[PDB]
C-alpha cells in the first residue's frame, strides 16, 4: 500500500527438479528489474499483477532455489500460500506425499493447492484427488490459460481472508 500495488501475496512453489514446475509459472512474468549481479544468475521468483475488487494485487511466486538439497521441515513461515507440484512420473507423487503432510502438520490461514505434465510425451490417476481430500487441499491436473486462471482464483481466497 506504499508503489503500483495495494496488497502483496507471497507464494511458495515447493517441488523437485524434473517435476514440471516451470510450465506453471509461464504466465508469471519475470521481474523486469536488472543489475550486474542479478543478470549473471537470475532469480528464483516470478511476479504478477491483477485487478481485484478494484485494487491492484501483486503475486510473487518462489521456486525456492535449492530446495532439492534440503527436505528437513522447520519453518521455511512467511508465505500467504503454499503450492506443491508433482504425473508422468512414479516417485513424484510418493515424495510429495511426505512433504504435503509435514507441511499440513506445521503451518492454518495459509492457502494450499496440490498439482500437471510438460513436454507431453502418465502413471498417476485422478484419485490415487484422494490423498489431497484426506488433508483438505484442492488438487488440479493442468497443462494453458487454465493454469493461470487457477492462480487468479487462488489470489481471491487470500483477499477474502483480509
Amino acid at each position: 500500500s506504499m508503489p503500483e500495488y495495494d496488497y502483496l501475496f507471497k507464494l511458495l512453489l515447493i517441488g523437485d527438479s524434473g517435476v514440471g514446475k516451470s510450465c506453471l509459472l509461464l504466465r508469471f512474468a519475470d521481474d523486469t528489474y536488472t543489475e550486474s549481479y542479478i543478470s549473471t544468475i537470475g532469480v528464483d521468483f516470478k511476479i504478477r499483477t491483477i485487478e481485484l475488487d478494484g485494487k491492484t494485487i501483486k503475486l510473487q511466486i518462489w521456486d525456492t532455489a535449492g530446495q532439492e538439497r534440503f527436505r528437513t521441515i522447520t519453518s521455511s513461515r512467511g508465505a500467504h500460500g503454499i503450492i506443491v507440484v508433482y504425473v508422468t512420473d512414479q516417485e513424484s507423487f510418493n515424495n510429495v506425499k511426505q512433504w504435503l503432510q509435514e507441511i499440513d502438520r506445521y503451518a492454518e490461514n495459509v492457502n494450499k493447492l496440490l498439482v500437471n505434465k510438460c513436454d507431453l510425451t502418465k502413471v498417476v490417476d485422478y484419485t490415487t484427488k484422494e490423498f489431497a481430500d484426506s488433508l483438505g487441499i484442492p488438487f488440479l491436473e493442468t497443462s494453458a490459460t487454465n493454469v493461470e486462471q487457477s492462480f487468479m482464483t487462488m489470489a481471491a481466497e487470500i483477499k477474502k481472508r483480509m
Partner: protein, 316 residues
C-alpha cells in the same frame, strides 16, 4: 570419473598426427592418430561395456549414448575404414605403409577436422581443470567457515563457467575426487535457509523487486555450487549437531551484496550498499546485546529504512 582426463588429453595431444610438409604414411599420419583419438574418447567418457574394447565397438557406443555429434562420429568411421582399406591395398603391392601424395588428398582433409575435434576437446578439458580449482577453493573457504570468501569464490566459479561456456553437468564427473563435509552441508543448509527467509521477508509493501532479487541471486549461486557436485534431486547430508549462527551468516550475505551490487543500485529510497551497512549495524547491535531471534531479525530483514529518524541515527 577418476578416469584421469589428464590422460584423455594426453591421448588427444598425441593425436594432435599433424599435417605433412609435398611428398604421407598411412600408419603415422592417419591410423595412429585415430587409435589414440579413440582411446581419448574412451578415457574422457569412461567408455565401458561389460561385453570398448574394439574400434567398431567404441564407435557403436558413442552413437548409442549420443556422446558426440553424429556427423563427427561418422567422420571417424569413414576415415578409419578408408585407412584400413589403404593399408591392405599397399601391403598387397611392391612402400607397404607409405602412399603417394595426391591419393591422400581427400583423407587428410577429413583428418584435419578430427584434429579440430581434437583441440576443441582438449581446450574444454583444460577449462574444466581450472573450474575444478575454483570450485575446490570455494569448498575450502566453506571448510574454514569464512562465509565472505565462500560467496566470493562461488561467484568466481560461476563467472568462469559462463565465460568458458560450461554447465553443471560438465564439472560433476571430475568432482568425484572431492567431497563436501557433513558439517559443511550444515553451513550451506544455514546459508540456504537464511537466504530463503531474507528473500521472502524483504518482499514488502514498500519494495519487492531489488532486495529479494539480490538475495535470491546469492541463494542461486550457493545452489549452483551445490549443483556442480550433486546430481538432480540428490539430497544433501547435513550435520544438525553443528549449526552456524543465523545472525553471522545473514551479515555474510549482506557483506556479499554490498560488494556485488551497483553503486547506482538503490533499494526503495536508499542506496543498496548503504542499506546493507544499516542492516549490518542493526544486527551487530542485536548481537552485541542478546536480542537476536527470528522475530527481531525479521524486523531488520523487512525494513526499508522508511523510518528516517531511525535510519539517520546510524549516520550521525
Amino acid at each position: 570419473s577418476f578416469s584421469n582426463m589428464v590422460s584423455a588429453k594426453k591421448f588427444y595431444n598425441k593425436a594432435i598426427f599433424t599435417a605433412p610438409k609435398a611428398e604421407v604414411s598411412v600408419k603415422t599420419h592417419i591410423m595412429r592418430p585415430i587409435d589414440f583419438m579413440l582411446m581419448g574418447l574412451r578415457e574422457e567418457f569412461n567408455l565401458y561395456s561389460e561385453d570398448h574394447l574394439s574400434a567398431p565397438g567404441t564407435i557403436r557406443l558413442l552413437r548409442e549414448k549420443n556422446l558426440l555429434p553424429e556427423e563427427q562420429i561418422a567422420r571417424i568411421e569413414s576415415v578409419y575404414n578408408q585407412a584400413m582399406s589403404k593399408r591392405f591395398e599397399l601391403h598387397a603391392e611392391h612402400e607397404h605403409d607409405e602412399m603417394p601424395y595426391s591419393d591422400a588428398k581427400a583423407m587428410l582433409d577429413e583428418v584435419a577436422k578430427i584434429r579440430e575435434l581434437g583441440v576443441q576437446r582438449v581446450t574444454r578439458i583444460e577449462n574444466l581443470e581450472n573450474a575444478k580449482k575454483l570450485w575446490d577453493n570455494a569448498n575450502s573457504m566453506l571448510e574454514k567457515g569464512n562465509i565472505s570468501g565462500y560467496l566470493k569464490a562461488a561467484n568466481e566459479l560461476h563467472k568462469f563457467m559462463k565465460e568458458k561456456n560450461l554447465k553443471e553437468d560438465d564439472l560433476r564427473p571430475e568432482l568425484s575426487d572431492k567431497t563436501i563435509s557433513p558439517k559443511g552441508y550444515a553451513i550451506l543448509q544455514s546459508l540456504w535457509g537464511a537466504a530463503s527467509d531474507y528473500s521472502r521477508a524483504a518482499a514488502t509493501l514498500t519494495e519487492s523487486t531489488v532486495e529479494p532479487g539480490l538475495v535470491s541471486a546469492v541463494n542461486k549461486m550457493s545452489a549452483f555450487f551445490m549443483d556442480c557436485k550433486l546430481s538432480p534431486n540428490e539430497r544433501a547430508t547435513p550435520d544438525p549437531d553443528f549449526k552456524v549462527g543465523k545472525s553471522k551468516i545473514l551479515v555474510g550475505i549482506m557483506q556479499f551484496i554490498k560488494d556485488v551490487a551497483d553503486p547506482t543500485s538503490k533499494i526503495w529510497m536508499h542506496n543498496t550498499k548503504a542499506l546493507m551497512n544499516h542492516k549490518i549495524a542493526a544486527i551487530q547491535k542485536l548481537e552485541r546485546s542478546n536480542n537476536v531471534n527470528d522475530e527481531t531479525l525479521e524486523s531488520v530483514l523487512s525494513s526499508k529504512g522508511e523510518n528516517l529518524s531511525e535510519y539517520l541515527s546510524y549516520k550521525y
